[PDB]
Amino acid sequence: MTDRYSFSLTTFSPSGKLGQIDYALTAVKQGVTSLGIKATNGVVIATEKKSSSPLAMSETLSKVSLLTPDIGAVYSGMGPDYRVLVDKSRKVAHTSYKRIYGEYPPTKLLVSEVAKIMQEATQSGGVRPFGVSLLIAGHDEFNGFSLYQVDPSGSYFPWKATAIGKGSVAAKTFLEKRWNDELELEDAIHIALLTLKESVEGEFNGDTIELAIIGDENPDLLGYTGIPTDKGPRFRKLTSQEINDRLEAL
Amino acid sequence: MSLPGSKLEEARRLVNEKQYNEAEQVYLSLLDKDSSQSSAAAGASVDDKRRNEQETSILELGQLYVTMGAKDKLREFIPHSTEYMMQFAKSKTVKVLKTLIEKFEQVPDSLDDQIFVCEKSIEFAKREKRVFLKHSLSIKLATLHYQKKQYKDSLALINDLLREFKKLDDKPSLVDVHLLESKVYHKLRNLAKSKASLTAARTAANSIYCPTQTVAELDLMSGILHCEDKDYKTAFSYFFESFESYHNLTTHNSYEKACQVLKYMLLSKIMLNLIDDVKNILNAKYTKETYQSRGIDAMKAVAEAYNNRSLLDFNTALKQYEKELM
Amino acid sequence: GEITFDGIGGLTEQIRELREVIELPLKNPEIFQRVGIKPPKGVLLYGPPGTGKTLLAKAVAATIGANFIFSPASGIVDKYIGESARIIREMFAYAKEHEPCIIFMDEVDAIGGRRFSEGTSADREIQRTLMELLTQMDGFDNLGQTKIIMATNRPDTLDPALLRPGRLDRKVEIP
Amino acid sequence: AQNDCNSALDQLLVLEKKTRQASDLASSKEVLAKIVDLLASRNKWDDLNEQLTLLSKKHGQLKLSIQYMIQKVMEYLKSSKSLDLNTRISVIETIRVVTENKIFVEVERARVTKDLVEIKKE
Amino acid sequence: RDRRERRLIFGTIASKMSLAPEADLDSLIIRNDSLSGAVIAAIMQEAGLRAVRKNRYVILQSDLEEAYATQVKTDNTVDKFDFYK
Amino acid sequence: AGYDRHITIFSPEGRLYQVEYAFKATNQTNINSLAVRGKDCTVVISQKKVPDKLLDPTTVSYIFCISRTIGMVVNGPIPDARNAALRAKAEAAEFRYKYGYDMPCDVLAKRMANLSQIYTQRAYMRPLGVILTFVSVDEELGPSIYKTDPAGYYVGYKATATGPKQQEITTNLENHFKKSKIDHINEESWEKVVEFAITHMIDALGTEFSKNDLEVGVATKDKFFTLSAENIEERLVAIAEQD
Amino acid sequence: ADVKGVCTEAGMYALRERRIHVTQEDFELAVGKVMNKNQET
């Protein structure tokens, strides 16, 4: 009685592929257009906000989560897989670093920690592997601003701009052409709305874009108005009005 | 005071109380002197916050100046004050540069004056990093030539701009030029050339997201070619599409657009011999609006002059209604 | 029909849907014509034949005084040149003369399959039949005083052509 | 005076229970004849008409009971003419039991329309 | 069919049947995203036909809406996909 | 492994067969629900029927009171509904000891979603079929409606519906809210809030229902209560008092 | 096979503009059309 399932559910096929990773990727291709840009004077990430219903809050909805204070992530794939994964990433990041080295994990180090979760899950049976791909966009004061891709298997590679979801390749073409480093964060926000207007047609607004930047400070993001002791967050998610203001700014 | 916002209010009061020329003296003095917040950029003033307000003074003068023949002074001022904007951000230069030629063309009255400003904006823009949209401004010059009655000269420029566009991703501009390229062709007597060009504007329009109004405007041209190349039925059907959509826009349709579709709609029926249906448009007021003008009265008069088999009645409308109608 | 429509009431829901698609255009073309949207095409009854589907089909015919045309779908399967073309043609021509009419197609899988497995043995006779029905429909001849009603237990051996609007548009289910 | 009015009102609350709104008791003109004729007696016919019209918007022992009573009162309104003539209009727009939408069938239904329409033409 | 394309199909079938200043296209553009030209024409045509069987001569934006909502589903399926909601 | 619907693992297409079938035929159990927000209340109306005269309909429950203040409306069957109830109840209670505070709708929703997801990846468990709508009048947000659905997806609402009269309910509330420029109506007494609910209900599902055919659950500040049978008729007669 | 497609796509351009030959121009535009397809999202 009870489970006995310990046989791996991810297995090799005659070609050298892994059935479960192939499947999972189809889901990711069909998922919501997300991109990431390093502006060099920041990092701007944008993703599609969506609504389920007009009578539905989209405050609760999670399309951009802060993994650690200076770092945000966005994705294309399977929403439920994303939500749990964010949780295990937040937990280990807090317990194992935030009073051990006395600060957040470096971006590359955090990409490896995610990578490991996904790989445990691919090796081991009882459970199928995560079906997701992430774009982890970040700042760490020992590597600047970074952009990574995290694949479903947990393969990762460095990027300085990319897009995943539906309609990626052409989105990368517009981004490649418009930005080539040394660019204001504001300007990268403008370029990003332009790339996505061409990418999404039928109805387009800044109330269907959810935009976050890592690329600012306020005293409010030290979390106190007194005498500094540390630097604190640089994650800031914008409200819908601010985004419409940048849509009005040519 | 001497700060920018106070000097906006005081100069504005100078227009009302006296004249634009008096206000202009104040505006010039706000550049020349009067210490203002943040870094200088005139040797005494801003030209950032100073420039957003500068859009507003150029505008205030600019409508009157082309009509007045005070044009020359309007013509000088913008070129001198462009080099201010260069000393601020990329975005600031982009926003101001593009506006100015459009501001003038909301109330045009000196085609010449408008042409002259625009050519310096095209040289000036090159000094930043912008060479994408200098052709987009070359459409603005082209519309002015069209109006001068220089179709031949416009033809020679317009094509070259079309070629640039499709490998710089200036795809929203492409719809604009294709429609204009058609108007040029139509006048030169190349009825064939106009349809083909228009079909390209149509492919281009559906490539991208765009306003409701743009889409309907090409369809207005489509129905206009379909009266000159026959098939009054097909002309009917687009003008129908334009008019339904403007009904749902209600009274938020712009004035020229709504009026021109309606002038055309009534006409297409008269040629088609659906005489009864001009009288139905006339009674209807969601499909005619509140509008009465000489045009609407002429169409009613001809369509009726048509039904009775009456030549006297035709001549009568032709003549009273003539300036607007013809 | 040989059984009444008001007498089989308690089958009420099905009765009303069937009245509103069939009776009103047949008696009064004039209303459908004024709006400028065509009269209804073809109707499907789907769900059990053994619950008294069959009773309903006869019953609708009884109130209109329409000519009830019962068809064995297999019998439309003669193995000779064109006998099979000829029957579809006769059935339609006679419907127009003897209009109003119900043309009732008993278990549609044999004149409106999907293919056995994508393969063929005899499932090309099925295609020959099926193109003829789609052709009359698509045609210049229009369904409005000739009504065709298809019946089958399952919708999972109807052709995709039929399931597409404009060869059936009304789909009544037995609740 | 009050007592006879009460026997109409209390007997109305008995009748509301009585009526038929599910498979309960039973749908009778017998009760409604007691209310409408003896309220006409307590009061007058015009007064009866306004109060009755509001009561009809709720139950009514199946609406044919109400439709029959509406025709009698109507004949009195017409007989007197003036503002009661106006009152016929008001009553017929308020409730539909003589221009009935629960069923389309009846002779009383038609009759009550023909009299209103004739006065309007005239 | 892109957004400018669907828009035309609602208009063209809408000409053929009863219409009034209520026959709001703006509503419709949100309601339909990229279905074939066959499909858009099929639906717009059916809805005028269905309203008239419900014993309505008039067609409104309200009328198209009530016909559509009936045809599209009879079972309840929660949002769209499992990929995004 | 095995197959994609003999055990829970990805489909060929990257879909999950089990979550989509969990959406469909768990609301067709003769259940239809709506929830709307008051001014200082939250109202739920939900269908709830008994097919025997021999089935005591008190024990019949599909609005549950999770705590003294928290309610959870389940759409879907009683075997599933009690697996989710046991979890909900436990979570509520645990929260109360450990964090010292009453359980918000949103926190409960989020926790249950993540848990269902884990059971979705498992090859020896199922996702539950149930759709869970968690209601109270929080003192940290006002009247609240938060709904989880079975895929590990969950999201907050201001007004929601489930069962295939979703479109009807939505449209009536949407037009109404666009006109009034608010998504909450203003009225103090619970009574007037239930009347507002019924108005939109009756129009939308096109029918009215008996006392024992309804079950109405009301959230108030620091209480959740279900309306007795007479109390649910009182309201249906009270609109008809107006008529 | 694409080199054969380029000529046939170039030809529809020539045909529309009512020429009795194809030109170099048509061929560049035709190459642009094929490249567009290869890049698919």
Tab-separated table of C-alpha atoms in Angstrom, chain B:
chain	number	residue	atom	x	y	z
B	1	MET	CA	8.702	86.675	-11.903
B	2	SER	CA	11.474	85.517	-14.114
B	3	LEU	CA	10.933	81.770	-13.850
B	4	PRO	CA	9.484	79.998	-16.907
B	5	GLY	CA	5.929	79.398	-15.819
B	6	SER	CA	5.184	82.971	-14.676
B	7	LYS	CA	6.734	84.219	-18.019
B	8	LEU	CA	4.346	81.881	-19.917
B	9	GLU	CA	1.303	83.555	-18.150
B	10	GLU	CA	2.533	87.072	-18.590
B	11	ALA	CA	3.470	86.675	-22.321
B	12	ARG	CA	0.064	84.882	-22.957
B	13	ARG	CA	-1.673	87.976	-21.466
B	14	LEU	CA	0.349	89.974	-23.782
B	15	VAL	CA	-1.290	88.264	-26.768
B	16	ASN	CA	-4.893	88.993	-25.522
B	17	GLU	CA	-4.426	92.486	-24.201
B	18	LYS	CA	-2.493	93.624	-27.310
B	19	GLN	CA	-1.054	91.440	-30.002
B	20	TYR	CA	1.091	88.426	-30.864
B	21	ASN	CA	3.977	90.751	-31.799
B	22	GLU	CA	4.009	92.237	-28.269
B	23	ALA	CA	3.995	88.699	-26.719
B	24	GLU	CA	6.833	87.744	-29.077
B	25	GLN	CA	8.955	90.620	-27.513
B	26	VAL	CA	8.303	89.204	-24.056
B	27	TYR	CA	9.151	85.575	-25.170
B	28	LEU	CA	12.371	86.768	-26.713
B	29	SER	CA	13.323	88.519	-23.422
B	30	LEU	CA	12.546	85.361	-21.407
B	31	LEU	CA	15.364	83.542	-23.505
B	32	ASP	CA	17.750	86.514	-23.352
B	33	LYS	CA	17.567	87.135	-19.544
B	34	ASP	CA	15.345	86.201	-16.509
B	35	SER	CA	17.206	83.635	-14.234
B	36	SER	CA	15.334	80.383	-14.113
B	37	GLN	CA	15.588	76.991	-12.418
B	38	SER	CA	18.246	74.390	-13.159
B	39	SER	CA	21.223	74.777	-15.715
B	40	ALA	CA	21.311	77.538	-18.294
B	41	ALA	CA	20.950	76.907	-22.036
B	42	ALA	CA	20.305	80.433	-23.512
B	43	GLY	CA	22.823	82.103	-21.194
B	44	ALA	CA	19.960	82.883	-18.834
B	45	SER	CA	17.130	80.418	-19.226
B	46	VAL	CA	16.051	76.749	-19.695
B	47	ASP	CA	15.218	75.412	-23.077
B	48	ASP	CA	13.973	71.983	-21.810
B	49	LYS	CA	11.043	73.155	-19.702
B	50	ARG	CA	11.717	76.272	-21.675
B	51	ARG	CA	11.213	74.196	-24.903
B	52	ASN	CA	7.885	72.426	-23.884
B	53	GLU	CA	6.541	75.939	-23.456
B	54	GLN	CA	8.466	76.974	-26.639
B	55	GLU	CA	6.184	74.395	-28.582
B	56	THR	CA	3.286	76.397	-27.227
B	57	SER	CA	4.587	79.880	-28.238
B	58	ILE	CA	5.618	78.702	-31.755
B	59	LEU	CA	2.146	77.248	-32.106
B	60	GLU	CA	0.419	80.512	-30.932
B	61	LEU	CA	2.314	82.630	-33.394
B	62	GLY	CA	2.349	79.970	-36.128
B	63	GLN	CA	-1.249	79.822	-37.126
B	64	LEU	CA	-1.437	83.606	-37.724
B	65	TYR	CA	2.030	84.121	-39.183
B	66	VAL	CA	1.512	82.204	-42.471
B	67	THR	CA	-1.721	84.142	-43.240
B	68	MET	CA	-0.357	87.464	-42.055
B	69	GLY	CA	2.849	87.586	-44.118
B	70	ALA	CA	4.615	88.055	-40.757
B	71	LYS	CA	5.856	84.643	-41.914
B	72	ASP	CA	9.524	85.592	-42.112
B	73	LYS	CA	10.021	86.127	-38.492
B	74	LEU	CA	8.280	82.821	-37.723
B	75	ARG	CA	10.660	81.106	-40.268
B	76	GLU	CA	13.922	82.372	-38.565
B	77	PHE	CA	12.957	81.707	-35.003
B	78	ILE	CA	12.606	77.907	-35.140
B	79	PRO	CA	16.006	77.324	-36.856
B	80	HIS	CA	17.815	79.400	-34.226
B	81	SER	CA	16.024	77.736	-31.392
B	82	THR	CA	16.536	74.116	-32.662
B	83	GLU	CA	20.243	74.155	-31.427
B	84	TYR	CA	18.847	74.512	-27.826
B	85	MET	CA	17.131	71.038	-28.086
B	86	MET	CA	20.254	69.331	-29.234
B	87	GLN	CA	21.782	70.103	-25.796
B	88	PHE	CA	19.044	67.883	-24.209
B	89	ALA	CA	18.023	64.327	-24.665
B	90	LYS	CA	17.350	62.194	-27.745
B	91	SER	CA	13.710	61.915	-26.845
B	92	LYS	CA	13.237	65.678	-26.437
B	93	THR	CA	14.775	66.374	-29.903
B	94	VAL	CA	12.514	63.621	-31.476
B	95	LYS	CA	9.261	64.962	-29.990
B	96	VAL	CA	9.834	68.673	-30.870
B	97	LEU	CA	11.279	68.183	-34.409
B	98	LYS	CA	8.365	66.088	-35.646
B	99	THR	CA	5.625	68.355	-34.230
B	100	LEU	CA	6.530	71.657	-35.766
B	101	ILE	CA	5.819	70.967	-39.442
B	102	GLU	CA	2.451	69.414	-38.468
B	103	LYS	CA	1.552	72.588	-36.242
B	104	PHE	CA	1.908	74.834	-39.216
B	105	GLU	CA	-0.199	72.522	-41.503
B	106	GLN	CA	-3.253	72.626	-39.188
B	107	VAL	CA	-3.896	76.053	-40.536
B	108	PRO	CA	-1.989	76.314	-43.812
B	109	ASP	CA	-1.998	79.574	-45.784
B	110	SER	CA	1.602	79.876	-47.059
B	111	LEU	CA	2.746	76.709	-48.569
B	112	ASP	CA	6.083	78.391	-49.274
B	113	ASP	CA	6.863	79.211	-45.600
B	114	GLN	CA	6.222	75.647	-44.462
B	115	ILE	CA	8.459	74.208	-47.171
B	116	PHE	CA	11.384	76.378	-46.117
B	117	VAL	CA	11.339	75.339	-42.379
B	118	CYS	CA	11.144	71.690	-43.111
B	119	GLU	CA	14.292	71.511	-45.244
B	120	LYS	CA	16.474	72.711	-42.348
B	121	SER	CA	14.877	70.155	-39.874
B	122	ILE	CA	16.006	67.358	-42.367
B	123	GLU	CA	19.732	68.639	-42.379
B	124	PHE	CA	19.577	69.309	-38.518
B	125	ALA	CA	18.290	65.806	-37.579
B	126	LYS	CA	21.232	64.178	-39.334
B	127	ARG	CA	23.597	65.803	-36.819
B	128	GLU	CA	21.966	63.718	-34.015
B	129	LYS	CA	21.687	59.985	-35.153
B	130	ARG	CA	18.456	60.124	-37.030
B	131	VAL	CA	18.244	59.307	-40.658
B	132	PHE	CA	15.259	56.914	-40.344
B	133	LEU	CA	12.517	59.505	-40.327
B	134	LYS	CA	14.037	62.232	-42.484
B	135	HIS	CA	12.071	60.614	-45.233
B	136	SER	CA	8.932	60.707	-43.037
B	137	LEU	CA	9.449	64.464	-43.021
B	138	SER	CA	9.953	64.318	-46.869
B	139	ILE	CA	6.253	63.186	-47.011
B	140	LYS	CA	5.404	66.437	-45.264
B	141	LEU	CA	7.189	68.440	-47.989
B	142	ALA	CA	5.427	66.232	-50.606
B	143	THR	CA	1.979	67.087	-49.381
B	144	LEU	CA	2.838	70.807	-49.752
B	145	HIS	CA	4.069	70.282	-53.376
B	146	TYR	CA	0.747	68.417	-54.175
B	147	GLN	CA	-1.168	71.426	-53.054
B	148	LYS	CA	1.155	73.826	-55.013
B	149	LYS	CA	0.004	71.734	-58.032
B	150	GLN	CA	3.410	70.251	-58.601
B	151	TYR	CA	2.428	66.540	-59.066
B	152	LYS	CA	5.571	65.914	-61.281
B	153	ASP	CA	7.930	67.216	-58.677
B	154	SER	CA	6.246	65.239	-55.826
B	155	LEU	CA	6.354	62.028	-57.997
B	156	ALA	CA	10.124	62.326	-58.370
B	157	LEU	CA	10.654	62.500	-54.589
B	158	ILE	CA	7.894	60.293	-53.295
B	159	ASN	CA	9.078	56.969	-54.802
B	160	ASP	CA	12.541	57.160	-53.333
B	161	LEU	CA	11.126	57.478	-49.784
B	162	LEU	CA	8.993	54.395	-50.350
B	163	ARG	CA	12.075	52.381	-51.135
B	164	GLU	CA	13.868	53.373	-47.883
B	165	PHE	CA	10.954	52.577	-45.603
B	166	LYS	CA	10.732	48.821	-46.028
B	167	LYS	CA	14.223	48.057	-44.679
B	168	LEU	CA	14.340	50.595	-41.845
B	169	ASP	CA	11.022	49.357	-40.122
B	170	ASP	CA	9.310	52.647	-40.718
B	171	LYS	CA	6.188	50.590	-41.391
B	172	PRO	CA	3.598	52.980	-39.778
B	173	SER	CA	4.923	55.675	-42.134
B	174	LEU	CA	4.423	53.373	-45.137
B	175	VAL	CA	0.649	53.499	-45.046
B	176	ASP	CA	0.824	57.273	-45.082
B	177	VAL	CA	3.075	57.496	-48.097
B	178	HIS	CA	1.154	54.838	-50.069
B	179	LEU	CA	-2.101	56.807	-49.773
B	180	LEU	CA	-0.360	60.009	-50.846
B	181	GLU	CA	1.451	58.173	-53.741
B	182	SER	CA	-1.989	57.221	-55.002
B	183	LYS	CA	-3.337	60.844	-54.908
B	184	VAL	CA	-0.342	61.937	-57.033
B	185	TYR	CA	-0.988	59.112	-59.538
B	186	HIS	CA	-4.685	59.816	-59.771
B	187	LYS	CA	-4.123	63.471	-60.768
B	188	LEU	CA	-1.364	62.633	-63.429
B	189	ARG	CA	-3.931	60.320	-65.104
B	190	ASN	CA	-2.748	56.900	-64.109
B	191	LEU	CA	-5.839	55.402	-62.719
B	192	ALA	CA	-4.138	51.899	-62.933
B	193	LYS	CA	-1.145	53.072	-60.856
B	194	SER	CA	-3.337	54.277	-58.091
B	195	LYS	CA	-5.095	51.019	-57.448
B	196	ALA	CA	-1.878	49.044	-57.235
B	197	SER	CA	-0.238	51.451	-54.776
B	198	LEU	CA	-3.350	51.399	-52.569
B	199	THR	CA	-3.357	47.559	-52.442
B	200	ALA	CA	0.189	47.905	-50.990
B	201	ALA	CA	-0.997	50.434	-48.372
B	202	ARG	CA	-3.645	47.802	-47.486
B	203	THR	CA	-1.065	45.012	-47.088
B	204	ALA	CA	1.062	47.356	-44.999
B	205	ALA	CA	-1.896	48.516	-42.811
B	206	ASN	CA	-2.766	44.978	-41.858
B	207	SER	CA	0.842	44.140	-41.051
B	208	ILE	CA	0.556	46.386	-37.880
B	209	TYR	CA	-1.748	47.616	-35.299
B	210	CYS	CA	-3.062	51.169	-36.196
B	211	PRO	CA	-6.075	53.603	-35.375
B	212	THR	CA	-9.664	52.905	-36.555
B	213	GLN	CA	-9.640	56.161	-38.538
B	214	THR	CA	-6.604	55.286	-40.798
B	215	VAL	CA	-8.182	52.057	-41.918
B	216	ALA	CA	-11.389	53.774	-42.860
B	217	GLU	CA	-9.416	56.486	-44.661
B	218	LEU	CA	-7.810	54.088	-47.176
B	219	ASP	CA	-11.206	52.606	-47.706
B	220	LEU	CA	-12.351	56.179	-48.578
B	221	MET	CA	-9.718	56.258	-51.311
B	222	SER	CA	-10.707	52.759	-52.414
B	223	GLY	CA	-14.299	53.862	-52.859
B	224	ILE	CA	-13.033	57.123	-54.698
B	225	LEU	CA	-11.033	55.064	-57.235
B	226	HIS	CA	-14.068	52.743	-57.570
B	227	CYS	CA	-16.206	55.702	-59.070
B	228	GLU	CA	-13.385	56.646	-61.636
B	229	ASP	CA	-12.725	53.006	-62.601
B	230	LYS	CA	-16.420	52.153	-62.341
B	231	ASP	CA	-18.323	49.663	-60.164
B	232	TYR	CA	-20.540	51.957	-58.144
B	233	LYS	CA	-21.646	48.879	-56.240
B	234	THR	CA	-18.044	48.316	-54.881
B	235	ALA	CA	-17.707	52.027	-54.146
B	236	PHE	CA	-21.007	51.727	-52.153
B	237	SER	CA	-19.847	48.897	-50.057
B	238	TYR	CA	-16.614	50.595	-48.622
B	239	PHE	CA	-18.304	53.901	-48.071
B	240	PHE	CA	-20.887	51.806	-46.119
B	241	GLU	CA	-18.082	50.317	-44.026
B	242	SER	CA	-16.561	53.818	-43.340
B	243	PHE	CA	-19.947	55.287	-42.379
B	244	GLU	CA	-20.982	52.450	-39.852
B	245	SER	CA	-17.754	52.789	-38.084
B	246	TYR	CA	-18.086	56.573	-37.871
B	247	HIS	CA	-21.611	56.041	-36.500
B	248	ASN	CA	-20.134	54.032	-33.520
B	249	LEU	CA	-17.382	56.742	-33.105
B	250	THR	CA	-20.475	59.036	-33.022
B	251	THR	CA	-19.524	62.716	-33.109
B	252	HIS	CA	-15.766	61.859	-32.210
B	253	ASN	CA	-15.030	61.448	-36.040
B	254	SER	CA	-12.993	64.446	-37.347
B	255	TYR	CA	-14.877	66.986	-39.509
B	256	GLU	CA	-13.312	66.549	-42.939
B	257	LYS	CA	-13.499	62.730	-42.847
B	258	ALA	CA	-17.171	62.449	-41.984
B	259	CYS	CA	-18.355	65.135	-44.394
B	260	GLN	CA	-16.301	63.660	-47.445
B	261	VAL	CA	-17.673	60.128	-47.042
B	262	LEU	CA	-21.169	61.410	-46.844
B	263	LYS	CA	-20.709	63.664	-50.006
B	264	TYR	CA	-19.449	60.720	-51.856
B	265	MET	CA	-22.060	58.240	-50.555
B	266	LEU	CA	-25.020	60.223	-51.801
B	267	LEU	CA	-23.287	60.762	-55.247
B	268	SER	CA	-22.522	56.996	-55.900
B	269	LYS	CA	-26.254	56.100	-55.587
B	270	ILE	CA	-27.282	58.851	-58.093
B	271	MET	CA	-24.921	57.335	-60.772
B	272	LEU	CA	-26.041	53.782	-59.837
B	273	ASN	CA	-29.793	54.742	-60.290
B	274	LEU	CA	-30.828	53.927	-56.643
B	275	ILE	CA	-32.556	57.400	-56.496
B	276	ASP	CA	-34.789	56.288	-53.684
B	277	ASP	CA	-31.916	55.574	-51.367
B	278	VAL	CA	-30.542	59.255	-51.484
B	279	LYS	CA	-33.918	60.297	-50.038
B	280	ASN	CA	-33.552	57.544	-47.253
B	281	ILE	CA	-29.952	58.915	-46.301
B	282	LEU	CA	-31.614	62.360	-46.043
B	283	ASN	CA	-34.221	61.208	-43.619
B	284	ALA	CA	-31.711	59.170	-41.583
B	285	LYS	CA	-29.594	61.027	-39.037
B	286	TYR	CA	-27.303	58.266	-37.754
B	287	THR	CA	-26.112	57.939	-41.404
B	288	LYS	CA	-26.063	61.601	-42.258
B	289	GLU	CA	-25.484	63.102	-38.794
B	290	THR	CA	-26.685	66.628	-38.114
B	291	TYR	CA	-24.863	67.861	-41.078
B	292	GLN	CA	-26.399	70.208	-43.650
B	293	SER	CA	-24.285	72.086	-46.171
B	294	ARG	CA	-24.565	73.060	-49.858
B	295	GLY	CA	-23.186	69.737	-50.937
B	296	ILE	CA	-25.936	67.801	-49.108
B	297	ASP	CA	-28.541	70.162	-50.662
B	298	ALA	CA	-27.058	69.689	-54.226
B	299	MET	CA	-27.184	65.872	-54.067
B	300	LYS	CA	-30.770	66.053	-52.993
B	301	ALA	CA	-31.553	68.549	-55.701
B	302	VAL	CA	-29.763	66.542	-58.513
B	303	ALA	CA	-31.170	63.168	-57.432
B	304	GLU	CA	-34.600	64.692	-57.397
B	305	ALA	CA	-33.928	66.726	-60.680
B	306	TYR	CA	-32.979	63.221	-62.041
B	307	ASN	CA	-36.312	61.555	-60.956
B	308	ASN	CA	-38.713	64.055	-62.517
B	309	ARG	CA	-36.628	64.011	-65.810
B	310	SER	CA	-36.007	67.754	-65.268
B	311	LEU	CA	-33.146	69.715	-66.778
B	312	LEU	CA	-34.217	73.210	-65.341
B	313	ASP	CA	-33.840	71.859	-61.774
B	314	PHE	CA	-30.337	70.476	-62.563
B	315	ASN	CA	-28.969	73.708	-63.825
B	316	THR	CA	-30.431	75.507	-60.791
B	317	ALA	CA	-28.551	73.317	-58.266
B	318	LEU	CA	-25.389	73.417	-60.309
B	319	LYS	CA	-25.067	77.125	-60.089
B	320	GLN	CA	-26.238	77.977	-56.431
B	321	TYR	CA	-24.325	75.152	-54.969
B	322	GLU	CA	-21.314	75.506	-57.282
B	323	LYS	CA	-18.387	76.727	-55.129
B	324	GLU	CA	-18.542	73.956	-52.536
B	325	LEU	CA	-20.027	71.320	-54.816
B	326	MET	CA	-17.808	71.702	-57.799
